[PDB]
């Protein structure tokens, strides 16, 4: 028997109410139950008696906290297969002043989103720079690459250096 | 002189901020068996001194602290340090408390003051490391002194730890172990391999502790080492002065010979 729970902000309930039946169909195929509470604003997920995969409660936990941290349902469901995981990079504790912090964070996003979209294409990940953290879904090599590019982007070196060396390493691993 | 509760108050009309004269009047009252009027004078000295002149208030605090360490109480010395903290920076006030404890010859209170320094100011800078080295050197344990200095140098930055090691080596040449001083000198010359600021420090410390065959030979190696003409001639002239102070004319000539060998390339 196992049970996890996240609690989600109030503005998400009209979206989670919509996609909740699809959540129930994507977890009942793994034989694991889940409720969402609209009066306390939470999503809990419980291992039932018919559950024979014990690791799936961890991925269901990651799923409901991704639905908390605002990643779309068809983007979020890919946790349920094995070669996919979350990472939550922490960026707030690198530089002191607000001006340089938001300029390096906007540098991590990119002009028109080009840096972030090219990083998603290279690392095969789903990346959300949000607030003072950076969430990411992907394979584990992609998580390792996105952690090094974000933690080196909070230091002074421009992330398009890492996009360039990722293209170099892809076409240099293709031999 | 002004040495009472009436004559000092009458004669202090010309200079009310008289820190040394107020300290002497308070010590004269305490020798005159008036501790109450002595402490009243020691507390009103900083009040009769100016407000912006912090050094006079620190001097009145040190005077009340010395009177409390001589014929007063440790609570009055702590008030004197809180008073020192009410007259100046807290780390300097606690260092004045450590000095009053060293004057009162309390070894446990001196070690507690050096530890309270080596935590806060030991993580801040190297003055607490110097204080811990002073306390353990007066306690005659150079191993524990070097251990506390290395611990405080690890707690603080390491960019001044080279000058801290040179100061530890000079203190060990002064009143410690000469082999330990030469070992710390070699470690400092290793940490500053590009700078001969540790080489001249080692040579000056050995020549000060009368290690002539050490100082002149190491300075001759430094003068014939990878140095310029001025950097070679200064070290070779210092080594020749040390060798002539020892009585070595041919070695003083060979120092200049190595200088002429290294300056011409």
């Amino acid at each position: 028997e196992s049970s996890f729970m996240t609690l989600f902000p109030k503005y998400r309930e009209s979206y989670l109410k919509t996609i909740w039946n699809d959540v129930t169909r994507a977890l009942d195929k793994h034989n694991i139950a889940c409720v969402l509470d609209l009066v306390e604003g939470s999503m809990t997920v419980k291992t039932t008696r018919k559950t024979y995969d014990p690791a799936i409660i961890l991925k269901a936990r990651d799923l409901i906290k991704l639905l908390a941290r605002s990643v779309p349902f068809p983007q979020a469901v890919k946790i349920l297969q094995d070669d996919m995981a979350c990472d939550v990079i922490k960026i707030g504790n690198f530089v002191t002043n607000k001006e340089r912090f938001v300029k390096r964070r906007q540098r991590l996003v990119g002009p028109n989103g080009n840096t972030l979209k090219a990083l998603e294409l290279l690392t095969k990940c789903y990346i959300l720079v949000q607030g003072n953290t950076v969430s990411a879904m992907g394979p584990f090599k992609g998580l390792k690459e996105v952690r090094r590019v974000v933690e080196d982007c909070m230091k002074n070196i421009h992330p398009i250096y890492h996009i360039k060396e990722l293209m170099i390493k892809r076409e240099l691993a293709k031999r | 002189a002004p040495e009472s509760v009436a004559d000092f108050e009458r004669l202090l009309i010309g200079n009310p901020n008289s820190s040394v004269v107020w300290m002497n009047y308070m010590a004269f009252q305490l020798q005159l068996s008036e501790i109450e009027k002595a402490r009243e004078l020691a507390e009103r000295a900083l009040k009769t001194i100016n407000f912006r002149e912090e050094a006079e208030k620190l001097n009145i605090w040190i005077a009340m602290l010395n009177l409390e360490n001589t014929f007063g109480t440790e609570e009055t010395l702590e008030e004197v340090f809180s008073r020192a903290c009410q007259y100046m920076d807290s780390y300097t006030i606690h260092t004045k408390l450590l000095g009053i404890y060293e004057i009162s010859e309390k070894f446990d209170k001196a070690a507690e003051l050096f530890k309270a320094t080596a935590k806060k100011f030991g993580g801040e800078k190297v003055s607490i490391w110097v204080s811990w080295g002073d306390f353990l050197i007066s306690h005659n344990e150079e191993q524990e002194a070097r251990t506390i200095l290395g611990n405080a140098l690890k707690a603080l930055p390491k960019r001044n730890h080279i000058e801290v090691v040179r100061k530890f080596a000079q203190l060990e040449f002064a009143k410690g172990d000469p082999e330990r001083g030469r070992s710390l000198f070699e470690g400092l010359v290793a940490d500053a391999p590009k700078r001969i600021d540790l080489w001249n420090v080692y040579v000056d410390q050995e020549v000060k502790a009368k290690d002539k065959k050490k100082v002149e030979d190491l300075f001759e190696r430094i003068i014939t080492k990878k140095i310029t003409r001025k950097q070679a001639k200064f070290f070779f002239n210092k080594w020749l002065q040390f060798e002539e102070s020892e009585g070595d004319e041919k070695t003083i000539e060979y120092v200049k010979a190595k200088a002429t060998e290294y300056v011409a390339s």
Binding site: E1, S2, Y52, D53, P54, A55, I57, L58, K59, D82, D83, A85, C86, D87, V88, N93, F94, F140, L143, K144, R147 | -
Partner: protein, 118 residues
Amino acid sequence: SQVFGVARIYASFNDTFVHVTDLSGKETIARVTGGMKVKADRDESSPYAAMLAAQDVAAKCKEVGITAVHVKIRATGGTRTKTPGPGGQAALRALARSGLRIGRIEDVTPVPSDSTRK
């Protein structure tokens, strides 16, 4: 009727550890860290290495007598990745598949609590 060990599995990047102590944790039983079952020096964090390590861990747990295991899954934590690697799911899947009963999933990765990077 069941007697419980505790799994203490550690799914870092670059390795996976399966280290099933007794219920206190003072006395360890059957550590078979991943990078020893099969090593190409890359596959040490792989699900195949994790399930090999979990299967002979469960073999030695069955020969000692432990039939069920409270499982504690730990990522590399600290000021680092904080998410479990590829082997944390595969280790406890193989421990459940190889006859050993599973209880009490919990994450004991070291959330660093206002850590040290400046």
